[PDB]
Amino acid sequence: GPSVFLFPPKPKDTLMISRTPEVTCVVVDVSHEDPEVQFNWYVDGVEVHNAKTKPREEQFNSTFRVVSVLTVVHQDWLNGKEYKCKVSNKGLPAPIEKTISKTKGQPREPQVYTLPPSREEMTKNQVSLTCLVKGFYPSDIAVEWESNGQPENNYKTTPPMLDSDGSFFLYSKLTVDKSRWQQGNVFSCSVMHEALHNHYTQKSLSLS
Amino acid sequence: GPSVFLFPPKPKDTLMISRTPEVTCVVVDVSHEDPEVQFNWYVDGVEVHNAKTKPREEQFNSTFRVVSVLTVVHQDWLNGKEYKCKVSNKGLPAPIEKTISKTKGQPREPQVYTLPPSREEMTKNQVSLTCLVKGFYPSDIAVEWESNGQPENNYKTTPPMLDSDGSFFLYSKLTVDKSRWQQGNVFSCSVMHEALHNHYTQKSLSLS
Numbered sequence: 001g002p003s004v005f006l007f008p009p010k011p012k013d014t015l016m017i018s019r020t021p022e023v024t025c026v027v028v029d030v031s032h033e034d035p036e037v038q039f040n041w042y043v044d045g046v047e048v049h050n051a052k053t054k055p056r057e058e059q060f061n062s063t064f065r066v067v068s069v070l071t072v073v074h075q076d077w078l079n080g081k082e083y084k085c086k087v088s089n090k091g092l093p094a095p096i097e098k099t100i101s102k103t104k105g106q107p108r109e110p111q112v113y114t115l116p117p118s119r120e121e122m123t124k125n126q127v128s129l130t131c132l133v134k135g136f137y138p139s140d141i142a143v144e145w146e147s148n149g150q151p152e153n154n155y156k157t158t159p160p161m162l163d164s165d166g167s168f169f170l171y172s173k174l175t176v177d178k179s180r181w182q183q184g185n186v187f188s189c190s191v192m193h194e195a196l197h198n199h200y201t202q203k204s205l206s207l208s
Numbered sequence: 209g210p211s212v213f214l215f216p217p218k219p220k221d222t223l224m225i226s227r228t229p230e231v232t233c234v235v236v237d238v239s240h241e242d243p244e245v246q247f248n249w250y251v252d253g254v255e256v257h258n259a260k261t262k263p264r265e266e267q268f269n270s271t272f273r274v275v276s277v278l279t280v281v282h283q284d285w286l287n288g289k290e291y292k293c294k295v296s297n298k299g300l301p302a303p304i305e306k307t308i309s310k311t312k313g314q315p316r317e318p319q320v321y322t323l324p325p326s327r328e329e330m331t332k333n334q335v336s337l338t339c340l341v342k343g344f345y346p347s348d349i350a351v352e353w354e355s356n357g358q359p360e361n362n363y364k365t366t367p368p369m370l371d372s373d374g375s376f377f378l379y380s381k382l383t384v385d386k387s388r389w390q391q392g393n394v395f396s397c398s399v400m401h402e403a404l405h406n407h408y409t410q411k412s413l414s415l416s
């Protein structure tokens with residue numbers, strides 16, 4: 001009894017023409033005696049044929065794992081085109097069909113807010129700078145940090161939370177040596193999200 | 209083939225003598241033909257006998273569900289005592305054993321920081337006030353908000369995130385009408401966590 005899992009591309013993959021968005025079709029618990037698999041892909045029901053089917057991998061539990069990767073057009077996904085994977089195995093009476101697309105909902109533009117460390121935080125040798133992203137829909141988003149055009153390393157972001165009003169929000173937290181902050185260095189969280197003009201925005205933060 | 213799941217109490221249950229901490233032993237996919245179950249509980253291997261075993265509930269998939277609830281002593285769990293559930297069913301060749309205890313690790317005191325809304329946020333009719341809890345271990349924690357001793361309603365908190373240094377942190381976000389904030393009302397996130405003196409602390413925030 002095999003099952004299939006269908007993964008969407010990653011947000012910023014989608015948002016940057018530069019990047020390569022992929023839809024991933026994963027089939028597990030494939031019969032170890034009859035490992036032969038057939039993938040079929042569809043774009044709004046339209047069969048396409050450009051998917052790279054990876055070599056089957058033997059797992060440690062007497063099953064195989066089978067991955068099919070479809071390259072997608074940025075705009076296509078953005079315009080909410082459907083991607084359906086069909087998987088046909090001889091040890092299964094009917095082929096499995098999963099489908100995925102950009103989540104159905106009105107797009108909503110993220111509001112970004114930079115926030116100092118707390119007065120009391122100025123006790124410790126590390127401070128936390130606070131990026132705040134809210135109101136956005138869907139959930140698919142990415143934040144980064146940087147200073148002097150160079151990306152910062154020591155930050156962490158939450159996974160998006162559902163807000164009362166059906167929007168999502170999240171916080172990003174960049175920690176830095178107090179000295180940097182007090183020297184008046186400028187830092188900015190950058191946010192990628194389909195609702196943004198050019199899918200990107202930057203909001204800066206430095207000690208007043 | 210039944211399975212068991214063993215749930216810990218909830219943080220603040222543990223932290224307030226007032227509250228009632230419970231350890232929950234859940235057994236699912238119990239045979240619909242042979243539904244007869246036997247629970248056994250243990251405190252550091254020591255069998256106790258004070259658990260309330262709930263009536264078995266027929267599920268919609270031809271299985272039963274069986275819950276056993278053990279009341280625990282606040283200090284006991286706090287001192288990291290072990291709670292092992294044994295489940296014995298006739299349709300299973302060996303009884304299932306799960307065990308749980310306060311997570312193993314050095315306790316670490318949460319640092320709480322209140323943070324204004326962003327200057328730019330003062331555009332909208334709703335603002336966000338920002339409670340920040342960091343450095344804590346373990347993860348089991350709870351935040352609330354209040355003003356004028358009355359609990360606030362419209363806030364949301366993230367689930368704890370793992371921080372670089374093996375600590376957890378999280379943010380709480382309380383939204384309020386701009387007018388309240390500009391009137392100079394005082395708001396404070398309150399945090400319950402075992403590392404706190406008296407398991408509690410409060411940090412306030414009002415417009416300067």
Ligand SMILES: *[C@@H]1O[C@H](CO)[C@@H](O[C@@H]2O[C@H](CO)[C@@H](O[C@@H]3O[C@H](CO[C@H]4O[C@H](CO)[C@@H](O)[C@H](O)[C@@H]4O[C@@H]4O[C@H](CO)[C@@H](O)[C@H](O)[C@H]4NC(C)=O)[C@@H](O)[C@H](O[C@H]4O[C@H](CO)[C@@H](O)[C@H](O)[C@@H]4O[C@@H]4O[C@H](CO)[C@@H](O)[C@H](O)[C@H]4NC(C)=O)[C@@H]3O)[C@H](O)[C@H]2NC(C)=O)[C@H](O)[C@H]1NC(C)=O
Pocket residue numbers: 004005007024026028029059060061063065
């Ligand atoms: C033999 O050993 C095998 C290898 O270990 C093992 O295979 C594994 O099988 C499980 C199923 O039991 C399967 O689990 C699914 O995982 C989905 C996410 O997979 C992630 O994360 C894991 C680890 O965290 C990674 O190892 C995977 O590679 C994968 O990572 C992603 O991979 C893709 C491409 O490779 C990347 O693009 C991603 O970036 C990357 N992510 C990360 C974080 O790195 C998970 O979503 C599945 O959840 C759904 O099914 C569960 C039941 O299995 C339900 O509990 C749950 O509710 C989900 O249901 C769905 O919910 C959706 C809404 O959220 C709906 O849309 C769906 O309709 C609904 N239901 C479905 C589809 O049923 C799931 O947990 C693993 O993927 C798989 N391992 C690998 C490596 O492929 C075998 O089980 C072993 N067999 C036996 C018999 O023991």
Ligand SMILES: *[C@@H]1O[C@H](CO)[C@@H](O[C@@H]2O[C@H](CO)[C@@H](O[C@@H]3O[C@H](CO[C@H]4O[C@H](CO)[C@@H](O)[C@H](O)[C@@H]4O[C@@H]4O[C@H](CO)[C@@H](O)[C@H](O)[C@H]4NC(C)=O)[C@@H](O)[C@H](O[C@H]4O[C@H](CO)[C@@H](O)[C@H](O)[C@@H]4O[C@@H]4O[C@H](CO)[C@@H](O)[C@H](O)[C@H]4NC(C)=O)[C@@H]3O)[C@H](O)[C@H]2NC(C)=O)[C@H](O)[C@H]1NC(C)=O
Pocket residue numbers: 212213215232234236237267268269271273
């Ligand atoms: C027939 O229909 C039945 C009823 O719907 C159904 O029963 C369900 O079976 C599934 C297993 O498939 C079982 O899922 C487990 O759920 C655990 C959490 O349960 C929560 O959340 C659900 C919904 O979100 C609630 O409905 C539950 O009541 C329960 O809520 C909690 O309940 C307790 C007491 O009631 C409260 O105190 C809590 O406050 C409350 N929570 C909330 C949010 O309200 C989940 O933790 C389990 O995860 C582990 O097993 C998975 C495999 O099933 C793994 O993918 C996963 O990795 C986990 O593995 C563990 O990881 C741990 C570390 O994190 C380790 O410690 C463990 O060692 C390791 N492994 C284990 C134990 O295997 C799990 O998903 C449901 O609980 C159960 N439903 C109910 C209502 O009890 C049947 O499946 C149906 N049968 C069939 C054949 O279809």
